[PDB]
């Protein structure tokens, strides 16, 4: 039961944190293939190609980390969803394509910023930290 | 009417629990053929062919067996709907291939793990524990 | 109006109530055809063949008619919808084919069971108890 | 403003009001056509061919003449949306063509039924009780 | 900041209020069509055609101009989005194409009526009433 | 963190603020395309080509330089999320195309307008106020 | 408009309908011949010799009078395109000649026979049942 | 911009209107004869003879006028692309020759009939009607 | 209406079936020989010599019965459209002259097999299993 | 890239835009001769005479110089893909030669008329409007 | 039910995997020849002279075996159709014949490239990897 | 993989790029001659003399070196399948013969051209750009 409240990313090559921070996800997927028979009773599957993808959530601010995302860009993140601290696990992706961003705001809001990113090429690499 | 909050998953290869656990679901379905003719009054069906699908939502913690599960990989479940204890009913999958998982986490909240599975070759099947 | 509380399925084949009921469902359909011709003000249409589904979710014990249940079986199904007290009318189905069941469960909730059914080559026959 | 609790709908072949009525509704239909040259500004458009659908929900009853309806069954219908006092504006269709029903109950509801129909060949008169 | 209480529809060929008006909405658009090159950074675009279209809900009432509006009716708009007051601007729709009504009721509400509407020729034209 | 509630959009080309805002939005997107070969085990991917969208929403007002926007008009944006205070980020858009409106309205609301555009050739130019 | 599933299909010669019907075909030709000369504006032509043929496709059945059928046999025919009704109008062909069968399946489907003939010596014969 | 679902064709010799249309094509030719010399840039062409063709289908009934055609058969058509109303153009086409019927149904249709003719000695002559 | 997912082809030569089958299809043709004389109204026909055709496809397996089909080998085939179960009919064919093969895959998909064979000097002779 | 939906066609001897356009279309063509040696590792080839062709379709109405055209006519075209703004390039034909026309309709579009042209003895020359 | 994506090509001459496949394909074939007499019922076969052809469809790069062939080379293949683990068959072509290559690409795609071979002299050994 | 978004067409013998281009392609074939005796099992084959072919779409503008194509022109080519960037390679073909152009348009779309051509003495010579 990690935290939460302490979820960190970062800019891998530059090395600074993002920012004012909402919410971040992830996902991991493989494709299925399942045929049969004449006479079969269950039909059979496996995976052929795996990919991944995921997006976070900031508030706007023109002077962060954040706003120099652009799409098109090629990033290597790295995930902590419990922080820093020594032990913690982190997901890093390398090769991390940003695929779209939307901004928007309310006339009693903040205004929002949602990244939206894929992987090129790579699959994140689980490790834990020092 | 069984309790509900007693239910254990294991991955049966290795024997261990997964942890935290938040809920769990199963499926199976069979594909049907509709036919008819001209001049009859209803229309006729049958069963082809058979599968089975579920998922389960844990709290991310990188200490657990929960950890390993990555797509692609070959499992074997069990499934205890009311518990370990003796004359509990447990659906027992070999071969289950997980598909795809999906990491996320709320400002707010604690950070949630989706392991998403299917069946390839075989059937879940019931059984009564000693 | 009936009670609705009081609603009793039954197995007819081998004669046992299916046990802790939560809802069920029936329906009828028939498929339409339509056609016009140029210069005509309205559409003219037709039914040419007829169906029937439905379903039923029940809580889920190990223990009763309802887990016997398998996709792909045929069963021969009875619908009190006001209990079996004389006089009281029920649609019994023929030849009732079980397509899918779905099992499932929340860490704060009674593991429950949704049979899905359909109908293959009869239509549910209205009738009264008596 | 009418009322709306005072509806009714008959049966114009055998006279009979519903019964437990809960809900009606009805709609009215044609086709677009539009097209358009290189060069123009706006787009032009005209009404084919008209249809015309709706269906009602009454509580379950099987002695009731909501029961004898059946998909597939030709029935002259007459709505009346203000009650049957002089000079309330009624619709009635002829040849209404009932193509479907879905029964269904809860464990504290009551069974209810919804009726959903068709028109075929005619269009839904206007008109005003005398 | 216009009342929004005070909106009037008429029908601009006989001159008459609607009668009891609920809501109503317009709209306008026009199609666009993107194309690029073999080693372009942007897509470019144009707009081709436009169209217009909306709708209005009232009470249902026999006795009104609101019950005339039959579909397929060509019928010449107005809509006073501020009131009928000198120096409110209106958007006047001639040619307006009546594309289907729905009629509905419920046991405990008042029988209410959505004509939906469409233009075939020209566009909304805006003005400024004297 | 911006205010929010300072947002200011203007038409470039008159230099006119656009009246009583409500909220505004934006966004950038570029296409993916992904491949890979027998014997791979993560997909590949680039990003093709770009685009830009928004829209935003005002109360409708006759007298204002809001009601002057019209589907297929052309019209350069500058869209201030924090205001026109020195040092503030606007993202100026050359070459916006404005696609669709939408106005509506209800008994117990004010007249809203939707304006809907596109960018056509050029991208969002990212800037800093003086 | 003729209903389309009420289509009955005979061998007149033993008296016997087909079975499981899908759809049926018929047609009917002349040979066409075209001449002009030096000096012409259009051109000119007449019709020779006539034809029929024809075919149908059935759900494949070991136990029907569909099996009997088998290429280089002569059958008469009598096609009911709206039924057996009384003044329904039937085309019976005399001398029928069947010309080629194709019998096939597949792993989720229903087997199929299309039989396909041809006319020898007369042409179909319209009539009015009686 | 002739609204099309007005299209009306008619037996010139009985006046009769066909039935129920779905479709109707016409067509007009003139055979090429191209030549050129050693030396030449570009190859010459002219057109020596002309002819027509075209066909409709309708909805296959017994009891219209769309029943008496046969091929061989030599009858007079008009072709009212745009209705009858008076200033619509329409070809009128004198010994057409009807050279083929076929006639076609499924399980979930109408019969249709789809009637194919040419053109013998005289080509379309265009009007307008009175 | 027999099932069509139990059909089962067999080497009768050898007793084995052919393992994983995807489809089967069989034909029967005869010739036909038309003439007519100066003054005929229609054209007559009979049938000369016939033939047999037909193919299935499999998922392709080294260790089968169905990877020692080379093209050229002469093979007794036997197909059971509906099971071996006993009255159901099945096509026997001798001296089945198999003809040309065809593998092939994709980088997502099974690679699958298609045996093509025609007759030679026998045709098909239909039988009841006992 | 130009507009594509501002193409204008017109009869250059008659000076008069077509009308209701939906698409035009162009070809140039000119033929090939290979030849090659006994000991040669490549073919040569060369062009001998050119020519030219195509289409345009138009929604069909009687009055206008679209219903002018007729197989066999000489007409001088001018096409000009961008409008007739100047700079704007046109292919202008002279000698077109006219080969058929193609008329229909359905029950729910609009009469539609296909122009088919060619070129006799001159080909089409490009140029700059003024 | 081999994987399908683990298929591997090979240049047996020199020995190198041919880079990213997307699809390979084979074929086998035997010419036949049909013959019977005056007075037969059934017609007769046999097989001459066989043949074998296939390709295989790539990504297209310069730097890989795969941009070595070209049409008129003569090469040693081997086909893995289920990888080279050992027990796995693979059909291996000797003096394979390159008869074509065709390259294409689009806007939106990767480059890609068709080899298209046969087989001169000899036909595929079928074996097993040890 | 290339990125196939890059490809660059020259004019060589002018250098200058073609224009807003959409999809290239290329081909090369060598006839093949097959040959057996009376008595042999596989047919032999060779490879007698090759050709090469070709296409490109490019939108339809006037001011390009796309517009000077003309058929009949010899023009020097050079394909550029991954950019100009040092390192790629680039299919040079010398004599390249432009065999046909197809210029066309929509109502709703860019006028697009199509150019066509061919090899005349020599074959595609690839390199590798420095």
């Known amino acids: 039961?990690?935290?939460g409240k302490d979820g960190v990313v970062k800019n891998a090559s530059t090395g600074d944190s993002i920012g004012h921070l909402?919410?971040?996800?992830?996902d991991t997927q493989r494709d299925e293939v399942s045929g049969w028979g004449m006479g079969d009773d269950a039909?059979?599957?496996?995976?052929?190609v795996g990919r991944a993808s995921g997006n976070f959530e900031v508030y706007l601010d023109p002077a962060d980390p954040s706003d120099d995302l652009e799409p098109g860009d090629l990033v290597d993140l790295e995930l902590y969803p419990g922080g820093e601290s020594t032990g913690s696990?982190?997901?890093?992706?390398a090769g991390a394509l940003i695929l779209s961003t939307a901004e928007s705001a309310s006339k009693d809001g903040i205004p929002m910023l949602?990244?939206?990113?894929?992987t090129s090429g790579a699959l994140?690499?689980?490790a834990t930290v020092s």
């Open 89 to 93: 696990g982190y997901r890093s992706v």
């Open 114 to 118: 949602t990244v939206n990113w894929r």
């Open 22 to 26: 909402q919410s971040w996800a992830l």
């Open 124 to 126: 994140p690499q689980k």
């Open 43 to 48: 039909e059979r599957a496996f995976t052929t």
């Open 1 to 3: 039961m990690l935290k």
